[PDB]
């Protein structure tokens, strides 16, 4: 679920999901069009694609379970949707951590009109 993803992000990065990742660049928090602004934004682009791979799942509300094995995120077995949703979120949280070094506050609340063109998943 969005709230779970949010807590996973905070655990991973030390940044609050809202507002650090809820309106960042072209794809974080609301994505759809444009060339991603940086690596962090590409994390969201890929996460959007990941959810897009699951048309008949509901990642905003469906809750999954996971555990930490010495830092590592391990998705635990639920329904197929939950498993796949968890793997998407896990990847994004890792991606955000891997790109904290280039995160830029200038891309927070990035305006929609600077995000143009469709980029295929």
């Amino acid at each position: 679920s969005l709230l779970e993803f949010g807590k996973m992000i905070l655990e991973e990065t030390g940044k609050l999901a809202i507002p650090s990742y809820s309106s960042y660049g072209c794809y974080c928090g609301w994505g759809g069009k444009g060339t991603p602004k940086d690596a962090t934004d590409r994390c969201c682009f890929v996460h959007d694609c990941c959810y897009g791979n699951l048309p008949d799942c509901n990642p905003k509300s469906d809750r999954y379970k996971y555990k930490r094995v010495n830092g590592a995120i391990v998705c635990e077995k639920g329904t197929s949707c939950e498993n796949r949703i968890c793997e998407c979120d896990k990847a994004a949280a890792i991606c955000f951590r891997q790109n904290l070094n280039t995160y830029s506050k200038k891309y927070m609340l990035y305006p929609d009109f600077l995000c143009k063109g469709e980029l295929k998943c």
Binding site: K7, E11, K67, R68, N70
Partner: peptide
């Protein structure tokens, strides 16, 4: 909140 050690 999601502790296990440290």
């Amino acid at each position: 909140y999601w502790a296990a050690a440290a």
